[PDB]
Design a protein around this nucleic acid. Structure first.
Ligand code: ZN
Ligand code: ZN
Lengths: 76, 109, 148, 83, 93, 99, 85, 99, 82, 108, 94
DNA sequence: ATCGGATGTATATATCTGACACGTGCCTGGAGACTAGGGAGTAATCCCCTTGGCGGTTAAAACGCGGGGGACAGCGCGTACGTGCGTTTAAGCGGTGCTAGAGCTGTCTACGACCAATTGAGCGGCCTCGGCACCGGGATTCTCGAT
DNA sequence: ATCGAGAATCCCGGTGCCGAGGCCGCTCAATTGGTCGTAGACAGCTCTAGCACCGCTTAAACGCACGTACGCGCTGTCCCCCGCGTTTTAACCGCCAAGGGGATTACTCCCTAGTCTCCAGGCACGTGTCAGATATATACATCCGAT
């Protein structure tokens, strides 16, 4: 199901994600499509950082929504 | 003075001196009140009252009465010249007005 | 009442056009509670640090500005470690026409350059004014040790 | 229990007597309306301040002290009612 | 009940001192009380202001004397100033 | 045949009589009703001490008497004997009550 | 020549304009919106940040706040919207 | 042959010009000498500050301008266009200055 | 010693003041009355100013004294302190 | 409101709250002065000052000038029906008068 | 040097720099405005003092100043001043 | 210039009543003695500014003359207002009943005054550059004698 | 109804100057923190007088008719401010020079607020009686029509 995700660089991309997918499933799909490592990645929506321990079904996210991605530079 | 009699009697002042001092102290006028101010103020008040009462008594006597009434007070205040200027804004209750008719309105010969 | 419709429009227009470098959304199920995440500007010593802001909305909007507070300690002449804010647009220059997007972008702009005209905390502003390098180093290590 | 057109209670003979006390010999026919308007304006001015004075003190009945204080504020001192 | 103060006895004493036979009614008595209070407030307020102007903090006799000079018209001012001077001279010794 | 005065002299007699008395010329109850109406127009559910009503009536009577004195002065200045509303307006404007 | 309902809504209330008032800066606002701004806001135009206290005082005594043209236009174009409120 | 204005058409020009400016009208040294002469009666060998004299001049000018406005109104009320001493006296009496 | 100074208030000065007031025709007897009322007003203000100066044990009529005398008389003035 | 900011900025004024409080306390007005009185008084004073200044600046712009002069103050005060009533018995030095000419004196 | 004499010059200037960002004010107008502020302040404070005294009190709270403002100013000005002051005090208290 | 009605006003006498002048109990505010400290009087010094004077130049005041516009006096008109009388209306007075609200008293709790350390807001002094005063030439617009 | 000449007023451009706005050093007043005595907010009780109603006078208001005298418009006369040109006077600006007294500082002393104790001066309440208001009946001043 199409979903928008936008990084800190201002680029927004579309990914197919069913509501039953976990956050780690979305991270694995992100690895499949670009491969940016998930450890530096954090997902933000509704002022809350997404947790891999909760499926997107209970997160109550509708269609065509936009998520935020923040990169955590390991080092510096 | 001899510092023997009451302050009102000490200065020969009929108006009270202690009450004036208390009013000056607790009237929010100044941080301090001098020891000579209340005597002066009470003297001024008594003199003014004496003048007004003398004029009112004369006016009542000329009217064949022995009881001062507000009409006599208004006559005494208005007929004088200094007291008219001092009290030119006040309104005496039941005081009436002075009797005057403009010279023009009087009948022709 | 009307504030409900205003908040609905605000969430809708934040959702359709998300701001760049700032992400805001309601943590609580109620609409009044809100959270914002801000990432430091490129030309700043705040690289590698993300800051979280808690927002409480008054019963009446937009006539009364919403309260905001820093969750994490920030080293900046404008921003104390306690979390108070010294900003004119939030309270003195607040008007109904302002939106949450405008105030958040104003805060983001403030993060780039310190303002010593009205220093809430005097010693940190004085240290920054004395030399830029020491302030840059302390800000970098502070945002590295706390934010991450 | 509201009231209406009470300004007409200031009857023409009353204004005539007031003028005669003032010292007036001949009165035109249009004086009465102007005098009623003037009196109404003056009453409004005094009553507004009197009601404000009695409202500040958290009371419900306007008293003589309030009226005399309003009159003194407007510059028309009144004697014979206390204060 | 409560006790309210007034200048009744003093004004009556002055009246008997100036006219041993005439009497005064109640309305004239209230009028005299109001007049005394009004003049007192005027003089005291003017003296307080005048004392404040010169960066002083006390109301001596000369402040009241100058306030009397300012307020009352000419002849009354001169007579009242003379009377007050005599009263204070008698009091101080 | 019946004896009637020439128009004008009994006005002078009324002037002489009414300048000596000191009663209240306006009636009591109409004035009380008017002041109550104005007060209730200002703040509802108000009560009046009788002394307040008497003081208000005295003040209004004194003010009107003074205004009529000045109005007559203006009318005599204009070489007339009949006071007219323009004279009241001029007196009020000079006094500064309405400008 | 005729504005639509899309441009007819309040810029601060996002509802159909009810009893519009025109500011000196040629800005239109709904009457309850204006009252709330004057009671609680900083007594300035939300869009232009210019004081309207002088104009407000001048127009309050004569009850000149209302704008007849825009109010008539809105009440005739969308009577249902005005009536439902 | 010489061009002469109609009588009364340049007085309006003077009114228009003087109501437009703010400068002082009375001369300065005559006013200062008059003030010193008036003051030396109350107390001898007094001294004055220039600011005090300027303030006195401003106050007197404003008072006279207001009195002349009132006099003009009183004169026009009597169907005239010329001010006369009786107009000034009537205006002062109505204002109550000389009682 | 000074004397005969009310003549310093010339006819043109009174005409200019009246023109500011907004009058068109000025009679020939206005000037004397104007000089009289001006003299009365100056006396009234100067008395209070000099008394204020005397109380403060000073010897110069400061602008402040004139300002407070005018305020006492009911014609308060702006632009000289206060 | 939050503490740790100057009193004048706590309620967002410009006039000094502290100076007004000191003037009320040491001015021989009452034995005790409340803590909310000076703020309210400063608010009223600042509002009146801004109200005067707005009209003064409008008049100055009308006169093709950019520096406010006493004539502008007199024009602004006299042209407002409510400020004129408030400042009825005051004289503004170097102010002049409003321009008016009685309709009778105008030429035919 | 001289003594430190106080005034409202900087405060009036700051207020002026809000309504008109690009309009200066002369010195004479500054003195006139200073005198006006002093006059209004003294009027309001004196009326409040008398009003508090009439009720046998000892404190000049905000209510006395509010009623003094209501009495002294005309209608619309009184309403606007009361609104401004109430807003300022309720902002200050919280 | 009066003279006689006819009216209203001023004067003398009985009377009776409610407000005024006085007496009494008492309690709260005024008087007396003592102490501490800050406000004010007094002396000395500095320098700001107030008075006084001299010389030039020129805007302003003083004077005189022609005359046209306005102030003032007299006449005539009719319309509004004064004066008296009969009639309708509500103020004024008395008596009663009720309760909302003014006024007084007891608790105590939170607001405000006092005091010490201190640091930044705001005041005194300097300096500079731009808005405004001013001069010179020109375009625009009321004004009046003549049609 | 208008045309045109002479004069006052407004616009525009260039030049110069002084004072308004901004900056810096600094000294003192506002800030902050803590403590303590009391002002008034509140709950409760009393009891005063303000509100409402009802019935009976008769005093005041109301409508009407008749007459008359005063406002207002009009016309005529004369005289006095006004506009303008010429001459005389001192206002005004700049300059110099002295010293008078206003403003500030340091020191000392004595006047007053604060505290406690004690007592009598005046305040609320009650009471007797006479000053003045009211009713009744004469004496006289004044107005008006007409000789
Ligand atoms: Zn709205
Ligand atoms: Zn706008």
């Amino acid at each position: 199901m199409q979903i928008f995700v936008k990084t800190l660089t201002g680029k927004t991309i579309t990914l197919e994600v069913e509501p039953s997918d976990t956050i780690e499933n979305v991270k694995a799909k992100i690895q499949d499509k670009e491969g940016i490592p998930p450890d530096q990645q954090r997902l933000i929506f509704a002022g809350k950082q997404l947790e891999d321990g909760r499926t997107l079904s209970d997160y109550n996210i509708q269609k065509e929504s936009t998520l935020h991605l923040v990169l955590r530079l390991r080092g510096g | 003075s001899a510092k023997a009699c009451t302050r009102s009697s000490r200065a020969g002042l009929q108006f009270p001196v202690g009450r004036v001092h208390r009013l000056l102290r607790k009237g929010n006028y100044s941080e301090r009140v001098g020891a000579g101010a209340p005597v002066y103020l009470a003297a001024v008040l008594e003199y003014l009252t004496a003048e007004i009462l003398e004029l009112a008594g004369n006016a009542a006597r000329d009217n064949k009465k022995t009881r001062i009434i507000p009409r006599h007070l208004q006559l005494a205040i208005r007929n004088d010249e200094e007291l008219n200027k001092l009290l030119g804004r006040v309104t005496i209750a039941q005081g009436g007005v002075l009797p005057n008719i403009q010279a023009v309105l009087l009948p022709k010969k | 009442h009307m504030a409900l419709k205003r908040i609905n429009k605000e969430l809708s227009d934040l959702a359709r056009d998300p701001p760049a470098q700032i992400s805001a959304g309601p943590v609580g199920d109620d609409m009044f509670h809100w959270q914002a995440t801000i990432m430091g500007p490129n030309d700043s010593p705040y690289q590698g640090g993300v800051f979280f802001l808690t927002i409480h909305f008054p019963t009446d909007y937009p006539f009364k500005p919403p309260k905001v507070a820093f969750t994490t300690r920030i080293y900046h002449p404008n921003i104390n470690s306690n979390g108070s804010i010294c900003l004119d647009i939030l309270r003195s220059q607040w008007s109904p026409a302002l939106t949450i997007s405008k105030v958040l972008l104003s805060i983001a702009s403030l993060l780039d350059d310190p303002n010593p005209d009205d220093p809430k905390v005097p010693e940190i502003a004085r240290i920054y004014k004395t030399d830029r390098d020491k302030y840059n180093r302390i800000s970098r290590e502070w945002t590295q040790k706390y934010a991450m | 229990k509201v009231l209406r057109d009470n300004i007409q209670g200031i009857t023409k003979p009353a204004i005539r007597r007031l003028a005669r006390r003032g010292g007036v010999k001949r009165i035109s026919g249009l004086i009465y309306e102007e005098t009623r308007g003037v009196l109404k304006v003056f009453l409004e001015n005094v009553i507004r301040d009197a009601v404000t004075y009695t409202e500040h003190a958290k009371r419900k009945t306007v008293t003589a002290m309030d009226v005399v204080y309003a009159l003194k504020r407007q510059g028309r001192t009144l004697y014979g009612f206390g204060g | 009940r409560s006790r309210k103060e007034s200048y009744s006895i003093y004004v009556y004493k002055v009246l008997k001192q100036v006219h041993p036979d005439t009497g005064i009614s109640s309305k004239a008595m209230g009028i005299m009380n109001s007049f005394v209070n009004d003049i007192f407030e005027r003089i005291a307020g003017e003296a307080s202001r005048l004392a404040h102007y010169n960066k002083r903090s006390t109301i001596t006799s000369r402040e009241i004397q100058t306030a009397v000079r300012l307020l009352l018209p000419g002849e009354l001012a001169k007579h009242a100033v003379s009377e007050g001077t005599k009263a204070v001279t008698k009091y101080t010794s | 045949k019946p004896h009637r005065y020439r128009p004008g002299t009994v006005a002078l007699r009324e002037i002489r009589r009414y300048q000596k008395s000191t009663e209240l010329l306006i009636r009591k109850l109409p004035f009380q009703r008017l002041v109550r109406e104005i007060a209730q127009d200002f703040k509802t559910d108000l009560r009046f001490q009788s002394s307040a009503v008497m003081a208000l009536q005295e003040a209004c009577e004194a003010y009107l008497v003074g205004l009529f004195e000045d109005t007559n002065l203006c009318a005599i200045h204009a070489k007339r004997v009949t006071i007219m509303p323009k004279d009241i307006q001029l007196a009020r404007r000079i006094r500064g009550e309405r400008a | 020549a005729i504005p639509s309902l899309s441009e007819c809504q309040c810029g601060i209330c996002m509802e159909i304009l009810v009893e519009p008032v025109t500011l000196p800066c040629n800005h239109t606002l709904c009457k309850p919106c204006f009252q709330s701004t004057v009671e609680k806001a900083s007594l300035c135009c939300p869009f232009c940040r210019r004081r309207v206290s002088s104009w407000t005082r001048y127009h309050t005594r004569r009850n000149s706040l209302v704008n007849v043209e825009l109010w008539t236009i809105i009440q005739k174009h969308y009577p249902r919207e005005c009536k439902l409120r």
